[PDB]
Structures are given as C-alpha cells and as structure tokens.
Symmetry: D6
Subunit: 165 residues, 12 copies
C-alpha cells in the first residue's frame, strides 16, 4: 500500500505539469484587453486592473512547478558527479510544498468575482469594473488547490515512515 504511493506521486506530478502547460496558457490570454471600467478618465483602467490582479494566476503556478523540482535535480547531479541527501531533499520538498500551498490560499482565496470596485488615482471617487471569464478561472483555481493538496498529503506519508521526529 505504501509501495504504490510513490507511483501516484510521480503520476500526479506529471499530470499537473501537463495540465498547466497545455491548457492554462490560453484562458488568461485576453485578461487585460477585455477588462473594462465605467469611466471616461485616461489611465483609470490600468491602475484598477493592476490593483485587482497584482500577479496573474498562471505565472505563480509556473514558478511553483519549476521551484518544487529543484531538490530532485540537485540529488541527480550529485550522483552523476560521483543516504543523507535523500532525507534532506525530502525535508526540503515538504517545506516547499506547504509554503506554496499556504501562499496560494493567502493570495487568491477560493473564487474570482465578476465585479470589482476600485478607488485608486487617477479615478474620481469609486468606480465599478467588470471581469472577463470568472467561472472558468474559479474552476481552475479549485482544481489546482485539490491536486496540490493531494501532493501535500502524499509527501507527508513517506516522511513519517522513515522519519522519527
């Protein structure tokens, strides 16, 4: 039962990479061009879009995917150049995945609303703005959260079998 778990970790990792690389590049393609606010002021659109979406979802996910694969590359390069490395890389992977999951929760939450109200200069008082494609982005958010949670659960499993404290 604990033997097959490794296979599921490898399969989930590859599945996540494929989903992000093949489909995610094109939901966000028109994110700023189809964002519109009810106003006549030059420059209000730029400021309000920047305030609503500081970092796009797909950039965060690509960065996370690349960064969680670094301990494996280090371990592989070590063996090519030539037990402690295994434990250390497991600890580092655990830390990286919990940090990234909590950061995801704190940055974005669990939904993308359809309306946004912004009151940043050069806008006059508060104005109302409207988002493009909220439902698809919410579904993507929830799916990615679930898959990353599965991965977090899986990595903790192996730690306790080898680890003691």
């Amino acid at each position: 039962s604990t033997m097959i778990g490794r296979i599921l970790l490898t399969v989930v990792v590859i599945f996540r990479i494929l989903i992000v690389a093949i489909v995610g590049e094109t939901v966000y393609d028109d994110e700023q061009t189809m964002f519109v606010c009810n106003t006549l002021q030059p420059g209000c659109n730029q400021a309000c879009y920047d305030r609503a979406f500081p970092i796009s979802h797909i950039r965060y996910w690509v960065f996370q995917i690349i960064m969680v694969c670094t301990p494996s590359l280090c371990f592989i390069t070590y063996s090519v150049h030539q037990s402690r490395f295994y434990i250390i890389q497991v600890v580092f992977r655990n830390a990286l995945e919990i940090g990234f999951l909590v950061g995801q929760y704190f940055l974005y939450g669990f939904s993308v609303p359809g309306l946004y109200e912004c009151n940043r200069y050069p806008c006059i008082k508060e104005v109302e703005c409207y988002v493009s494609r909220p439902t698809e982005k919410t579904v993507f958010l929830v799916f990615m959260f679930a898959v990353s949670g599965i991965c977090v659960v899986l990595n903790l499993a192996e730690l306790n079998h080898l680890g003691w404290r």
Copy 2:
C-alpha cells in the same frame, strides 16, 4: 473477432487525439471577440458571454483526453519499477469513460443555437445576443459524441469476456 477489437481501440484513441490537437485549436480562437449583444451598457457583453459559455468545449475535451490515459501510465510505470492491475485498470477506464460521456451530455446537449437572450446584471431587462460560427461547432459536438460512444462500446466488450460479475 474479439482479437481485432483491441486494434480498433488503439486506432480510435489515436484518431481522437489527432483530431482534437490539430483542428480544434482554431475553430474556438475568436469565440469572445466576435460575440456581440444589442446594448449600450458597459460590461453587459462580459456577463452574458460568461453565462452562455461557462466552460469552452475544447478545454473540456483536452482535460478528458488527458485524464482517460492515466491508468495506462500507472500500469506502465509499475512494470518499469519492477494480473490484478489489468482488471483494476479496466474497471477504472470503464468508469471514467461513462462518467465523462454523461457529463458531456448534461453540460452541452446536442446543438449550439445562433441566438441567446440574457438578463444578468448590469444588463437592463432582457437583451439579445448573437453567436459566432454555430454550425461548425454543432458538427464538432456531434462527431465527438459519436467517437466517444464507439470507445465506450469497445471498452465494455473486453470487460465481459474476462469479467463474470
């Protein structure tokens, strides 16, 4: 007769992958840019498009194609690492393909109409909107439904020869 059936399963799977990857990427390319509603309200176009098409067809199909190939990858990785796996992966493939076919039917139906009437905020009362390229999308829908049905029929065939109950 039951021997050749496996060859037809492999050929249909590859055919589906090729059709989705080569042609589908470009029928949907202008889906939102050429969607137009009869109105003068900012933000009505975004809301009504989001209500008419929550998830685009091609995203659902790519996800389905990737997800129905996971039991094979798991079985292959197992053998590389090193009879029960065959039966279990057959059961899982059957379940995944029936679930995806029923979900397709419940989400989209069998046609894409040319007109859509929307009454979502910020629109005033009900408004009329107009869709781009309905006939091509309807043809694609019907073809994909037929091919997936063929695959469903084929997978059930092998289950009953080996299975008992």
Copy 3:
C-alpha cells in the same frame, strides 16, 4: 508500368500532405475578420457569414487527409502485434476516397464568388455581402480536386489487377 504506379501513389500522398500543411493554414486566416456586409444591424454579419460558409475548406481537407490514412495504420499495427487484410484495406481505401471526392463536389462546387446576398434574421429583407480573396481560394479548390482525382484513378488501377469482381 504497373510497378511504378505505387511509387506515384506514395509521392502524391506526401505531396498533398505537404501542400495542405505548409500553405493552406494562412490563406484562410482572416476569413471572417475581412468579411463585410452593407448594413447597420448588429448580428447580421455573423448570421450571413455562417450561412455562406458552413464548414471552412481547410477543416474538411485536414479531416479527409487524416481519415484516408486509417486502414494503413490498422494493417501496420496488426503486423506489429503478430493476405485478407490487404484486399479489405484496399476496398476500404477505394470507398473512402470516392465518398470524399463526391462529398467535396456536392458541398463546394468549382468556384468561390466575390458577392453573396443573404436574407437571414436579424437582417432586414435581403442585404449584399462581400468576400475576401476569392481567386486564390478558387485556384486552391481546383488544384485539390485535380490531385484527389489522380489519387482516385490510381487506387482503382491496383484493385482490378488483383480483384476479379
């Protein structure tokens, strides 16, 4: 004389694949963006374009190219897994190529006109619309018809040498 015919079948097939893949992707690129009608009604452009061009030429040709190569793939996979197959695949290829040629003739004809008059809702009475790049598309149509005819002639040749009735 009948020996070299096979070489010409292989060369024509590859030539057709290359022409469709390399050049055809870009004549049709702006098909809908540069289609214009003389009217002030929202939504008339979409309906009239959909009525004039239900399925784009290049989509039909890509589908045909992929579908006429399936019996060969089936025969090849059979030998990898391990005389009747040869005859059957020849019959199937013949049927597929005659069906596709007749369907091409019935769907599109032999020319693309420069003007089109449309009377579909929401348009008021009949309106006049104007097509982009008719001459290039007509030339492409005629060339593809000629090449497919050559292939049809070639496939019938081998059938009668081996076949009897």
Copy 4:
C-alpha cells in the same frame, strides 16, 4: 570544372530553401491589412486588392520549391524499393524549371508599383489605391529571379554533356 558544378547546384538549392523559409514569411504578413483606397464604399477595398494581387508571391514560390523536388524523391524511393531514371528525371527537372521561370515572368514582371488604380464593382468609376512596402518586395522579386536563372543555367549544363539530341 564540370565536377564542381553539382556542388553549386546543391548549395544554391539549399540557399533558396533557407531564404524562402526564414525571411519571406514576414514581409507579406500585413499585405491586406495595410492596403487602403480613397473611397467611402463598403467592399471596394476587397475587390481592388483581389484584382491587384490575385496570387501572393510567397505562395507561388513555396509551391515552386516543393514541386521542383519531386523527381528526386521518386528516384530515391525507387532505389529503396529495389540509368534510365537518371536521364528521365533530368529531362523532367529541366522542363519544370523553365516552365516555372517563364510563368514567374508572365505573372509578376520585374517591379511592384506604389500606386494602383481600380475600376471594379462596387467602386464608383475609377478610384486610387496605395500599396504597402513596394521596395522590399521589388528587391525580393529581383533576387529570386536571379537565383532561379542561375539554377536554370546549371541544369542545362549537365544535360548537354550526357545528352546528344
């Protein structure tokens, strides 16, 4: 002296392929979007552009490049499957290259002018239209004519050494 000539034929062929594939795809990219006529009539722009440029230069050149390489592929496939073929393929190459050069001269001439005057329906009387990037296209025309002429000269050389009449 006649020995090295073959090397120059191979080098010129590869040079032509590289120049057409790498640079030509992007001079013509905006050919129709930046073509403009002095008029207020819908549909006059489409008709006048179609009359000025029936077939784009780059499509003709790609077709020519692919078609002049067919006798070599036939000869190569023959040897793989298994003196007369050499002579026949030389004759065919000669014919194809003279035909394509004369056709180029008759279709396009030696320059692309900056102004064009068109009197096709739906335009009222004659109107004046203006072309984008004439100088670059003229230079490309002249260079391609020179290279193709060199190739024509080279192919005739070998014919007379082996040929008699």
Copy 5:
C-alpha cells in the same frame, strides 16, 4: 561544504535560464500598446515611451544570460580541438558578473513606478503618462537581482580557494 557549492552554481544557472525563457517572454508583450498619455498631440506617446524605457528589461537579461556563458564555451571548444584556461576563465566570469550586476543597478533601480511625467518634444510643456503592470515587473526585478547576487557570491567563493592574490 565547498564541494557541493559547484552543484548549486549549476542548478542556479539552469533555474535562471528556465525562468527567463519560459515566463518573461509574456509579461512585457503589451508594453507599448497599453501605455497611454493624457494629450491630443500626435507623436507624444512615442517620444515619452522611448524616454521612460530606453531598453526593455527582458532584452538586457537575455543578453546577459548569453554573454556570461562564453568562457565555458571557449574552454570546451579548446579541449575538443586538442590549467591556465581554468584560472583565466574564472577571472573573466567574475568580472563579467560584477559588471552586469552593477550595470543592472545603475540602469533600472529597484522599482517600476505607476506614473511618469514627460516633457519631450512634440509634447506641450509637461504631460502625465501611465504605466501598465507595475507590480509584476517590480517583483520580477527584485527576484532577478536576488538570484544574480547569489551567483556573484558563489563565484567569488571558488576564486579565493585557488587564488592567492
């Protein structure tokens, strides 16, 4: 401890290359199209954008990435063709990386502001302009500065072990 340092240099170099190649190409894509100034003068937008951003960040980083890999290529080619080379290439790498880091600091600083005021001809007096996506670009700046600093620290480490003065 000094042994593993080389592995971290190789991993950081590859990580930097991947981050620049995969994600950076698309934050800057719309840099000039969504830059807008409050004015009615033709040509003021071009001049003010040119004054605000003389060289785009991504061009500088790509150039730096390519240029810091030249001593390694020279050393590798030398061995293929066939101790002093090692020391010299280390000195050159050190010099190149300190020069590039200082140049980065002097050209761009540590942030990208949201507003810019420009007074260049043909603009009348001073005008106000507005930048697109400042926060994402600031984050990218800071991350790249940190990674390059790590690399600078690492390269100095090996110099002092072998070097004396």
Copy 6:
C-alpha cells in the same frame, strides 16, 4: 596566440547567430503599426514609411548571416563527396565580409533619428513623421557593427600568415 584566434572566430560567429535569432525578431515587430505622421491624407503614411526604411535592418542581417556561411558548406560538401579549396574559401570569406560591412555603413549609418520629414506624393508639401523605439535600434546597430568589425579583423589575421601577396 595565433592558434587560439580560430576558437574566437568560431565563438563570435555562434554568438552573432544566437543574438540575431533570439532577440532581434521582436524589437522590429511593430515597426510600421506604430509609425505615425501628422496629416489627414490617405496613403501618406505608407509612402513616407517606405521612403524612410526601404529595407528593414533585421532582414539585411539575416541575409548577411546566411550568405557568409556558404564557402564553408561548399568545402564540407566537397570532402563528403570525395589545399586549394582552403585558400580560395578564405579569399571569398574575406571579400564577402568587407563588402557586407561597407554596405552596412553606406545604407544605415550609425544612428536612427526620432523625427523624419517626408515630401512624397500623395502628401501635400512636407509633413513630419515620428519613429518608434529609436534608442534600442541605435544600440543594436552599434553592437552589430562592432561584432562584425571584430570578425573582419580576425579573418585578415589568418590570410597574412598563409598568404604572401
């Protein structure tokens, strides 16, 4: 000292190829779309852009890069088919590189100005036009001139060691 010079020639050639292929394709992307003149005449923009930039910089550089590599390909093909060739190809490389450098100097100079005044038909008298991104293009010009000069210097070095007169 003269031995290592060959390595530097190979490294500079590869460096130039990489810089042109990876970065240059995108500075010039919007060259004509963001070129604007102060006028109300149709067709003045096209004529004045054509007069200011007859051949784009990147097309000239790609052509030069491809053309300066032909003697090497000829020499390589000769050896594959099977001392005088070495001397002749050196002479030809020298001639090609001096000709291309002088042509660069005579066509473009050393800078790209921000303003251009044009008086070509259909423009009325003289008009003023405005260029996009002058500083980046000037920097690229200067860098390419320097690298090509280095290559010219290097090729002359080897000529005089083997050559006499």
Copy 7:
C-alpha cells in the same frame, strides 16, 4: 362683488396669453434632440418618442387659447356689420372651456415622469428611455391647470345670474 369679477376674467385671460407666448416657446425647444434610449437599433428613438408624446403640451395650449376667443370675435364682427348673441356666446364659451379642461386632464394627467419604457417596433423586446427636463414641465402643467380652473369658475358665475335654467 359680481361687478369686479369681469375685470378679473379679462386680467386672467391676458395673463394666460402672456405666459404662454413669452416663456413656453423655449422650455420645449429641445424636446426630441435630448431624448435618448438605451439601444443600438436605428429608428427605435423615433418610435418611442412618438409613443411617449403624441401631441406636445405647447401646441395644445396655443390651440386652446386661440379657439376660446372665437365667440367674442363673432359678436364683435356682428356689431361692426350692423341681446340673444350675448347669452349664446356665454353658453358657447362655457362649453368650450369645460371641454378643453376635461380633455387636458384625460390627455396628460398631473405629472411628467423621468423614465419611460417602450416596446414598439423596431425595438427588440422592451427598452428604457429617459426624458429631459421633467420638473419644469410638471410645474408648467400644474400652473396651467390652476389658471384654467379659475377661468372655468369665473365663467359659471355670470351664467347663473342671467340664466335661470
């Protein structure tokens, strides 16, 4: 007390004439030009304005003012040409003034609302339209109703003193 009543009738009549002639001509001046509906359909504005305001207030009032002065002119012309006439003209004046007051009440009511919703062809479903200057027009309505009521009361007074039944 009944003697002075005649003076008040003459003063009220002149007051009404002055108010209508001097001020009313300019509140209604922009009635249709500043009427706007939320729609993109040609011709919807005309139909909805016609349905909201069939006869403008000021035209009705001018007609009424002119028509209620006809019995006096007839009586005056009779005397110029040369007791029964007095009674008859009093009866006719009474009838005309009650008819006009009731018609005013039935046509317009007591207020002008700021919003109007119209569903007349060529409009799609129901649309919302917006009125200009509602408060001033409501005040004018109420004032005119009050003055006309005073006149009605005054004319009945004299009838009963001379009349019996």
Copy 8:
C-alpha cells in the same frame, strides 16, 4: 340664417390663417434632420427622403392660403381705382377652393405612416426608413381637411342664392 353665414366665413378664414402662421412653422422644422434609414450608402438618405415627401405640407398650405385671397384683393383695388365683379369673384373663389381641396386629397391622403420602404438609386435593393413625428402630422392633416371642407360648404351656400344656373 343666411346673413350670419358671412360672419362665419370671415371668422373661419382668419382662424385658418392664424393656425397656419403661429403653430405650423415648427412641427416640420426638423423634418429631414431626424429622418433616418438603415443603410451604409452615402446619398441614400437624400434620395429616399425626396421620394417620400416631394412637397412639404406647410409649403402647400401657405401657397393655398395666399392664392385663395387674390380675387378679394383685385375687387378691392378696382374700387379704390374708381356688380359684375362680385359674381365673377365668387365663381373664381369657388373654383379655386374645390381645386385646392381635391389636390390636397390626391397628393397626401389622410395619414402619415411611421415606416417607409425605398428602392431608389444609389440604394442597394430595397431599404427601410423611419419617419419623425407621424401622429402630430396626421392630426394636423385631418384638422386642415375639416376646416377647408367647412369653407367649401360655406362658399357654395351664397352662390345658389344669387346664382340661377
């Protein structure tokens, strides 16, 4: 009874003059500016308006009012300069008023419709146009017809008392 009839003729004539001069000048003021057709063709609006309304109602009525007062002016001037004149001027007035009433009926009818469909050059096929203020104009038409009929009836009365045949 026949004595008072003359007074009613004078009163009706003055009433008609006042109504036409005071109110009619401003219903028709915006007749052409607010006439709109669904089309993109220059010059279609002018032609279709000219075809729908060849002579405006108010011009016809002013001309009629002036022309029916000429016999009186002639008779008056005759007496100033100094029984047969009375009879002749009565005959002429009768003829003029019947001719003008019949001409009114034949030119305009009894209503002004809200829609008009026009198929005059330069319009393409038939187009639909929309009229401004139809109800007010219909009411004016009917009122003027009634008043002119009353006048016709009155003039015939006096003719038969003096006339015999």
Copy 9:
C-alpha cells in the same frame, strides 16, 4: 423727498424690465448643451442636470416681472370701465414683492458653483459634473437681488405715509 421716490420706483421698474428682456435671454441659451458629467452611462446627464437646476433663473424672473404688474392693470381697467383700490393694490404689491424676494433667496442662494456631484439613478454611485459659465450667472444673481431689494424698500416707504396700522 418723498415726492421724487415715485419717479425712482418707475425708473427702477423699467430698468429691470429692460435688463431682463435684452440681455438675460442669451447667457442661459446653452445651459444644458454644455453641461457635461464624467461617466459612460446613457441618461445620467439628463437626471443630474434636472437635479442641479430644477427651474432656470430666467424663467423665474420673467414670471416675477409679469406677476408684480397685475394690480396696476386691474386698477387701470377699473377706471376705464367707469380710493379704496389704491390702498388695496398697495397692500397686494407689498405682499407680492416680499414673497418673491424670500422665494428667490430660498431657491437659489447667492452663488452658482462650478462643480456639482450627483448620485441619482441611472448613475452608478456618485459622479462629478461640471457647470458652464458660473461667474456671469453669479454676477447676474447678485445684481437682480440688489435691484429687487431696492424696490422692496421703496414700496414700504409709501405704505407708512398713508397707512397707520
């Protein structure tokens, strides 16, 4: 001293009439056409203008001028038809002028501001609007208040000489 006061009353009355009739008709001419709000909503301009200026200044002043002259007309008509009337008309004039002055103060105040913020449907939240010609209108307000005050003072003077209580 009290004798000349009557002359000053007559002169001030005529002066006020002249100023209102000759100059006031044209300061307010463009009141609504040059009123503008920062918004993209149809119908917000109408509602906010109606809320800012319910009754225009010039309409109120014309009404006041006409209404304060009615007791004089009544007294004059009485004498034409044929001491108590003098006292009563003085009381009525006093009452009318105090009522109109207080009403002016309560409706408009003492200034017209340049900015106005409105939050009436269909506007979204609060919006900012901008007034035309505030200074001229403020000056007119103050001048009219001063003149009317002078008239009020003058009318009270005569009341106390004849009146007792």
Copy 10:
C-alpha cells in the same frame, strides 16, 4: 379690357413679392449642410458645391425683385420733389424684365438634377455628389418662370398702346 390689365400687374407684383419673402427663405436653408460627396479628401465637398451652385436661386430672385422696382421709386421721388418720365420708365421696366428673364433661363435652365459629377481639385479624378431636395426646387423654378413670363407679357401690352415705334 386694357383698363383691368393694370390691376393684374399690381396684383401679380405683390403676389410674387409675398411668395418670395414668406416661403423661399426656408427651402434653401440647409443647401450646403446636406450636400454630400462620396470621397475621403478634405476640401472636395466645398469645391464641388461651389462648382454646382455658383449663385443660389433665392439670392438672384431677391436681387431681381428689388431692381425691377427702381424706376417707380425714381418717378415717385420726382413728383414729391416738384409725361416724359412715364414713357422712359416704361421703356426701362421693359428692358429690365426681358434681361432678367433671359438671364434666368441661361443660368439655371428648367430643372435641378439629383446627381452631380465633379472633377475639380483637390478631388482625385471624377467623383459623384448628391443633391438635397431636387423636386421642390424644380417646382419653385417652374412657378417663378411662369409668373415672370406673365409679367413680361403684361408690360409689353401697355407699351404698344402708347408707343408707335
């Protein structure tokens, strides 16, 4: 019979004055604002309108009306200041009226066409322009020609009775 002719001259003169003064001022009001040509050139509209209508009809008619009344004013002033004058003024009136009628015929003809084609600088080649209200203007032309002809006939009558040669 010749006695009454003078009365008809006076009546026709007054009738003409009234028709020109009351109705003609408003058919021509929008003559240039609703004149439109199919072109994109600034300044073509002005030149083509000036070429089509050098002097407006109504200006010519007003000038004629004023100028044909000068001999009467001279004769009247002479008598006020204090047989030959009568004859001379008759001769002058005859001459003025024949000259003005012939000039009318030579300047304008008998109709106003709906289309006009103009080829004046700055227009490119020939362009097509469209006239407003042709039918009403044609009717006015014909009526004025008829009335002026009647006047010409009448003035000749009196000349021959008094004149001899």
Copy 11:
C-alpha cells in the same frame, strides 16, 4: 463753438447705440463653441473658458449703454409729472461715464491675445488653449474705447461753463 457741441453729443450717443445693437450681437455668437484646449480631460474646457472670459465684452457694453441714460429719463419723467435737476443730472452723468471708462480699462486692457494658458482644476498641470477671432475683437475694443473717450471729453466741456467749483 460750444453750441454745436451738444449736437455732437447727441449724434455720438446715437451712433454708439446703433453700432452696438446692429453689429456686436454676432461677432461673439460662437465665443464658447469654437474655443478649444489641447487636453483629454472632461470639464477642463469649461473651467478654462470661464477663467479667460469672466464677463463677455458685449454684455458689459449693453449694460453701460442702458445705465448711462437713466438721469435723462428721470429728468424727463419729472417734467411730465409736473434748474437744480439739470446740474445734478450733469454731475451724475459725468460720474457714471468716468467710472465706466476706468472699469473698462481695468477689466479688459487694450487687446485680446490668441493663446491662453490655464492651470485650473480639473486640468492636469498647465494646458494651452486657443481663442477664436482675436483681431476683430481687438478692433472692436479699440473703437469703443475711442468713442467713449470722446463722450467723456464732451461731457466735461459743458460742466465747466456752468459750474464754478
């Protein structure tokens, strides 16, 4: 010599009245509609026009013309109702004319410039605005100043003949 001076005062007064009433009403007609500023901000045009021209020239002149005629009206009314009045009215006329001339000089100066630079909210920093018809307005200013000066000189003349101190 002092006798004729009165005639010149009466003639100058009437001349001034005629010039102001007949010509001045139409130079200023388009004062605000053709005033334009180089900016994209709503509401900047209104504020800057209000700051440049607080009170229009023609309003000031009409007010002055009416106000300088009040002592004459008072004196005339006095005589109608029925030596000290003559002296007092002369003193008052003198005072009014010097005050109005000095006020004119302090408000407007001696010229109207063609450019104006404004820095009032809501404008961003300083902006440049452009005036319509400066030369005609400057000429009018100078002429009115000269005529008013002549009148001032004339009124002082009579004061010193009758006055002592």
Copy 12:
C-alpha cells in the same frame, strides 16, 4: 440734367442699404464653420482662419453705411434745434466716401480665392486650407465696388457746381 442727379443719389443710397440689409446677412453666416484645413493639430484652424479673414466683409460694409450718413443727421438736428453747414457737410461726405473706397481696395482687392496656405503657430510648417463659397463672395465684392464708385462720381458732381477751389 444736374437736377435729376440728386434723385439718383437718393435712390442709389436706399438701394445699397436694402441690398446690404436684406441679402448680405446670410451669405457669410457659415463662414468659419465650413472652413477646413488639412491637418491634425488642435488650434491650427482658428489661427489660419484669423489670418485669412481679419475683418469680415459684411461688418466693414455695415460700418461704412452707418458712418457715411452722419453729416446729414447733424445738419437735420441743427435745423430742428433752431448755408455754411451745406458746404461743410458736402466736403465731409466727399472725404468720407473717398477714404472708404480706397480702404476697401487696399483691404480686400477684387477677388476671393478658393485655396489659402497658412504657416502660423501652432501649425507645423505650411499647411493648405480651403474656403467656402468663393464665387458668390467675389460677385458681391464687385457689385459693391461698382455701386460705391457710382456714388463717389455723383458726389463730386455737385461739389464743382457750387465750389470754386
């Protein structure tokens, strides 16, 4: 012969007054609104119109008409209040009419051209502008010059009969 000359002076004066007052007010009505220049600069239109037409023709003519009637008014007022005056007023009239005629010639010339080229700030270099209605204005110029010349000739006639030197 010299007796009748006075009558012709009175008739010409009245004729000129009538022509200027009745027709001239409406040729110049749209002088600035239909003036257009080929440019994109704000404020160039105002400056170039001001430079082309400093004082409009009709303003100069009205001023001249009023000013040449002042000596008559002075002489008339003198006689009302109560030989030298006659001579002096004749001298003054002569001087005024020669001065005004020469000033007309020096200001305007004899024609109004259709094109005007202007190079005033804020325009860039020289630009081309286009005038409205040149032919009608030229005809008016010539007619007014002729009439004023006739008047000049007439006034000199009487001077020499009474005058000596």
